[PDB]
């Protein structure tokens, strides 16, 4: 039983429509009327939006509609809003008493204003130094779109060792956030002019700097 | 009114079996529903695991878990369970218990009721509580925070002043280090005139290690 195939990415403008495809075979989507669509926001349980190909559960907007043609099912979203921005999964019954999932489709709603990252750099705490360790903390937030590169500099010379950096993640204001850590010896911390954290958002670079004082 | 609540260890060792229960309230576990399990490796898609039918107690799993998995029901305490034997790193995921709509054909495919999800990590590494370091402040406002360093496994929770402080708070997702340990940070922006008078307490909780910390963050 082959997997259901969805497009990984899909986009639309506010007020407009978007159609998401789920392709199966003649013996699942083609044979049965048991196609479901699920909506999932970050760090939440998915939510039933469509079942039985065309039906809506209690409390689901009329803007969501399902259909199918041959081996392919489709979810249509009209009156596109920013809160419709989520991951969408199709599913179907498959014989031998099982359900098949699609790979999911990420829906992007166009027209979100660009934002520049707010950067906060922290020096090693006295308590950590007293534990003979040192950690720099670069906190990056409120940027859109969610692409950011991070460079560290001892005085002004690049440094890549002892650097762990997280992937971006969506905040509750649809902006993105990330963090970068520089592990060090108290020696390296003490024996330098100033360590710097520079954040490159699309084109521009914001820099913050701490000093051993 | 049908509530589904996952329960179980968030850390299992390789080769051991992964066990989870779903507590069902508001209806009987013996009613004609498909009690279903779903899992999601963080950052990836949905996997359909299988179900039990309430009336019969008959269960089925997907073809790739059929040799390691059982889903059954507990009639004494109104639950259904998932047991996955021979656990490996591929089994690390967030697990959901779910409910299929009443009386539907293939109800296990039309899941309208869900649990909150439970993350379980599969690793040989041991439970390690974090170290909490205060991030002391230095234009009208100032930034201070907590550093939650080197813990395992996920997750931890952070609050400021037991929830009383919410404005200007940003708690960041953890970084996974090559050591295999996690670290995260929380930061809050406050009026600089309130430093030295207003108490600022970072509340850190790491349930896997039973560690609870109330770190005071102070200037100078």
Closest CA to A28 of A8, A5, A55, A57: A5
Tell me if B183 and A1 make a contact (CB, 8 A cut-off): no
Tell me if A122 and B96 make a contact (CB, 8 A cut-off): no
> Which CATH code, of 2.60.40.790, 2.60.40.10, 3.20.20.70, 3.90.1150.10, is assigned to A9-109?
2.60.40.10
From chain A, pick out residues whose CB is under 8 angstroms from the CB of B63. 1, 96, 98
The single-letter DSSP state of residue B192 is G
Residue in the block written with tokens 């650097």: A163
| Distance of residue A45 Cα from the nearest chain B Cα, in angstroms | 6
Which CATH number is associated with domain B3-122?
2.60.40.10
**How is residue B69 written in tokens?**
């998995």
Q: Which of B104, B147, B170 sits opposite A137 (nearest CB)?
A: B147
Helix-then-strand count for chain A, H and E: 2, 18
Contact indicator for A89, B45 with CB cutoff of 8 Å: yes
Q: Distance (Å, rounded) from C-alpha B14 to C-alpha A192?
A: 45
Contact indicator for B39, B49 with CB cutoff of 8 Å: yes
**How is residue B215 written in tokens?**
């770190």
- Domain spans, chain B: 3-122, 131-216
**How is residue B51 written in tokens?**
């179900």
Is there a shared CATH topology between the B3-122 domain and the B131-216 domain?
yes
| Beta strands per DSSP E along chain A | 9-12, 18-23, 35-40, 47-50, 64-69, 72-77, 87-94, 98-101, 105-109, 118-122, 134-143, 149-154, 157-159, 163-165, 169-170, 176-184, 195-200, 205-210
Tell me if B109 and A99 make a contact (CB, 8 A cut-off): yes
The single-letter DSSP state of residue B150 is E
Q: Distance (Å, rounded) from C-alpha A108 to C-alpha B50?
A: 31
- Element (DSSP H or E) covering residue B60: strand B59-61
Closest CA to B135 of B166, B171, B179, B173: B171
Which CATH number is associated with domain B131-216?
2.60.40.10
3-state secondary structure (DSSP) of residue A189: helix
Tell me if A51 and B101 make a contact (CB, 8 A cut-off): yes
Q: Distance (Å, rounded) from C-alpha B155 to C-alpha B207?
A: 8
From chain A, pick out residues whose CB is under 8 angstroms from the CB of B185. 122, 137, 139, 179
Q: Distance (Å, rounded) from C-alpha B69 to C-alpha A213?
A: 58
Closest CA to A211 of A184, A193, A198: A193
Contact indicator for A10, A76 with CB cutoff of 8 Å: no
From chain B, pick out residues whose CB is under 8 angstroms from the CB of A103. 45
From chain B, pick out residues whose CB is under 8 angstroms from the CB of A46. 38, 46, 96, 111, 114
| Distance of residue A73 Cα from the nearest chain B Cα, in angstroms | 15
The residues of chain A that CATH labels 2.60.40.10 are 9-109, 118-210
Which CATH number is associated with domain A118-210?
2.60.40.10
From chain A, pick out residues whose CB is under 8 angstroms from the CB of B143. 120
Tell me if A122 and B135 make a contact (CB, 8 A cut-off): yes
**How is residue A113 written in tokens?**
């204003």
Method for this entry: X-ray
């Amino acid at each position: 039983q082959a997997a259901l195939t969805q497009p990984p990415s899909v986009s639309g403008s506010p007020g407009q429509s978007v159609i998401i495809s789920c392709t199966g075979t003649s013996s699942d989507i083609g044979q049965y009327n048991s196609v479901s669509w699920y909506q999932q926001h970050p760090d939440k349980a998915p939510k039933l939006v469509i079942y039985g190909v065309t039906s809506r559960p209690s409390g689901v907007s009329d803007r969501f509609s399902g259909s199918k043609y041959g081996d392919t099912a489709s979810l249509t979203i009209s009156g596109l809003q920013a809160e419709d921005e989520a991951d969408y999964y199709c599913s179907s019954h498959a014989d031998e008493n099982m359900a098949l999932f699609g790979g999911g489709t990420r829906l992007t709603v166009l027209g979100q204003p660009k934002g520049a990252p707010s950067v906060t750099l922290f020096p090693p705490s006295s308590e950590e130094l007293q534990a003979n360790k040192a950690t720099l903390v670069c906190l990056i937030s409120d940027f859109y779109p969610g692409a950011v590169t991070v460079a560290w500099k001892a005085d002004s010379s690049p440094v890549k060792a002892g650097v762990e950096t997280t992937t971006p993640s969506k905040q509750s204001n649809n902006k993105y956030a990330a963090s970068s850590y520089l592990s060090l010896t108290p020696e390296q911390w003490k024996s330098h002019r100033s360590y710097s954290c520079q954040v490159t958002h699309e084109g521009s670079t914001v820099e913050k700097t701490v000093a051993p004082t | 009114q049908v509530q589904l609540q996952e329960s179980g260890p968030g850390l299992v060792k390789p080769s051991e079996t992964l066990s989870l229960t779903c507590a069902v309230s508001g209806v009987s576990i013996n009613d004609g529903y498909d009690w279903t399990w779903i899992r999601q490796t963080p950052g990836k898609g949905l996997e359909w695991i299988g179900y039990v039918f309430g009336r019969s107690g008959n269960f089925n799993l997907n073809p790739s878990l059929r040799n390691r998995g059982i889903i059954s029901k507990d009639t004494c305490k109104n639950q259904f369970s998932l047991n996955l034997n021979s656990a490996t790193a591929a089994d690390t995921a967030v697990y959901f218990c779910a409910r299929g709509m009443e009386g539907l054909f293939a109800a296990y495919n039309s899941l309208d009721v869900w649990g909150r999800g439970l993350l379980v990590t599969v690793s040989g590494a041991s439970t390690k509580g974090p170290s909490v370091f205060p991030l002391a402040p230095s234009g009208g406002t100032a930034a201070l925070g907590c550093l939650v360093k080197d813990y395992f496994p996920e997750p931890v929770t952070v609050s400021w002043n037991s929830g009383a402080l919410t404005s200007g708070v940003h708690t960041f997702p953890a970084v996974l280090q090559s050591s295999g340990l996690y670290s995260l940070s929380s930061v809050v922006t406050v009026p600089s005139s309130s430093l030295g008078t207003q108490t600022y307490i970072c509340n850190v909780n790491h349930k896997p290690s039973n560690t609870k910390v109330d770190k005071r963050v102070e200037p100078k």
